[PDB]
């Protein structure tokens, strides 16, 4: 179990850790979060009480270093930093753990939600989508645009998701125009899986990371990427059986976790109705179709 200490909490803020969140008051004696499970990536995120604009946060893996949060009064936000001095970090953490000024990551023992949302998400891949190579952790916020969004303006602060475009030469083989547009299996299996992602775990990991950024930061381009990667599978006649089974589980847990009140903006009516009711894989996502029909029958 690992710990992300906080130097202090000088501004009132809602702090998220993975799917949990809690309110900290201005200058409350809050010194961080303890008992964070090892073996998973995590996201610690923020929404200032004064400015609900800009949710922002940091993806990290405690196996990659000792990280802590301190407020920066010049840039006006809680920044993740790394403590290089291990002994110093141990002492600062133990003292705060003794004074009980930390919240405990509140995982219920039965609960596999976070694992199921992050099963294929790896910190090394996150760091390639979010390019800032001097830090081991990755900052995301509501307003960052994707590489594909910029092609349609600061390249350093972008989300470099894999570009997927159904009406592109990459997607459409000369002489197979109709075939490849109506059945995307070529594009899915040869171009993306074999060519770009190398395997379906890396594909699913980017899909999961895009959903999480859409849900935690309301990041619009992430939401586009999540739906694009779903649609590319649902619109492929030929998908490995294991990939369909795993996708159904992935989507099921995303749909389960989505706040009921955010469905109107984070779910694309067209993509979902196509995937569940029209596409090649309309009969292949049983768990996802059941939760969608019972939780958001309005969208459909």
Ligand X SMILES: O=C(Cn1cncn1)c1cccc(F)c1
Q: In the set 33, 92, 117, 255, which binds ligand X (CB under 6 A)?
A: 92
Residue nearest to ligand X (CB): 68
Triad 223, 228, 229: Cα angle to 5°: 100
Euclidean distance between CA atoms 136 and 103, whole angstroms: 23
Dihedral of CA atoms 263, 269, 272, 275 in degrees, nearest 10, equals: 180
Binding residue (CB under 6 A) for ligand X from 7, 14, 189, 263: 7
Tokens representing residue 69 in the block: 């949060």
Using DSSP's 3-state secondary structure scheme, residue 32 falls into strand
Q: Quick one: which of 5, 57, 205, 221 contacts ligand X (CB under 6 A)? A: 5
Distances (CA, A) of 255 to 112, 260, 266: 15, 9, 10
The binder of ligand X chosen from 58, 68, 187, 211 (CB under 6 A): 68
Task: Name which of ligand X, another protein, none residue 71 binds, using a CB cut-off of 5 to 8 Å depending on partner kind.
Answer: none
What is the C-alpha to C-alpha distance for residues 161 and 284, in angstroms, rounded to an integer?
Answer: 26
Instruction: Give least dist CB 78 to ligand X, A.
Output: 12
Question: Which residues 6+ apart lie within 8 Å of 202 measured at CB?
Answer: 120, 125
Among another protein, ligand X, none, what does residue 89 contact (CB within 5–8 Å per kind)?
ligand X
Picked from another protein, ligand X, none, the partner binding residue 177 (CB below 5 to 8 A depending on kind) is another protein
Q: Which of 35, 83, 119, 249 binds ligand X (CB under 6 A)?
A: 83
- Residues of the shown chain interacting with another protein in the complex, contacts defined by CB under 8 A: 167-169, 172, 177-178, 181
Residue 24: what are its φ and ψ, rounded to 5°? Answer: -115, 130
- Binding string, 17-56, against ligand X, x = CB under 6 A? ----------------------------------------
Question: Between residues 167 and 241, which has the closer beta carbon with respect to another protein?
Answer: 167
H helix or E strand, kind and range, residue 16: strand 13-17
Nearer to another protein, 186 or 296 (CB): 186
Considering beta carbons, is residue 52 or 95 the nearer one to ligand X?
A: 95
Taking the complex as a whole, how short is the minimal distance between the CB of residue 159 and another protein, in angstroms? 25
Contact (CB, 8 A) for 31 and 8: yes
Q: Which of 30, 46, 58, 89 binds ligand X (CB under 6 A)?
A: 89
Strands 42-48 and 77-82: unpaired
Provide, rounded to whole angstroms, the least separation between the CB of residue 5 and ligand X.
4
On whether the CB atoms of residues 144 and 219 are closer than 8 A, the answer is yes
Q: How far is the CB of 79 from ligand X (least distance, A)?
A: 11
Name the minimum Å distance from CB 7 to ligand X: 4
Q: What totals of helices (H) and strands (E) does the chain contain, helices first?
A: 12, 10
Sign of CA dihedral 4, 50, 210, 113: positive
Which stretches of the chain bind ligand X, using CB under 6 A? 5, 7, 68, 83, 89, 92
């Amino acid at each position: 179990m690992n710990t992300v200490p906080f130097t202090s909490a000088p501004i009132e803020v809602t702090i998220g850790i993975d799917q949990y969140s809690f309110n900290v008051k201005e200058n409350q004696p809050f010194h961080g979060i303890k008992d964070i499970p090892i073996g998973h990536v995590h996201v610690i995120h923020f929404q200032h009480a004064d400015n609900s604009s800009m949710r922002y946060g940091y993806w990290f893996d405690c196996r990659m270093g000792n990280f802590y949060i301190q407020y920066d009064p010049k840039d006006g936000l809680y920044k993740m930093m790394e403590e290089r001095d291990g002994a110093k970090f141990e002492n600062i953490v133990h003292n705060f753990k003794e004074r009980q000024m930390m919240v405990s990551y509140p995982k219920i023992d039965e609960d596999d939600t976070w694992y199921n949302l992050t099963e294929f998400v790896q910190m090394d891949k996150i760091r390639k989508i979010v390019r800032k190579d001097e830090n081991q952790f990755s900052y995301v916020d509501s307003s960052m645009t994707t590489v594909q969004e910029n092609e349609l303006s600061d390249p350093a602060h972008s989300l470099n998701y894999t570009v997927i475009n159904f009406k592109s030469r990459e997607a459409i083989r000369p002489g197979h125009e109709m075939e490849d547009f109506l059945d995307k299996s070529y594009y899915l299996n040869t171009v993306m899986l074999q060519g770009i992602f190398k395997n379906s775990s890396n594909y699913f990991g980017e899909l999961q990371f895009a959903f999480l950024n859409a849900m935690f930061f309301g990041n619009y381009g992430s939401s586009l990427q999540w739906h694009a990667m779903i649609e590319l599978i649902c619109s492929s006649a030929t998908v490995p059986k294991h990939m369909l089974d795993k996708l159904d589980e992935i989507l099921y847990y995303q749909i389960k976790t989505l706040p009921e009140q955010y469905s109107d903006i984070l779910l694309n009516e067209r993509v979902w109705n196509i995937c569940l009711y029209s596409s090649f894989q309309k009969n292949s996502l049983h768990n996802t179709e059941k939760i969608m029909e019972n939780k958001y029958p309005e969208l459909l």
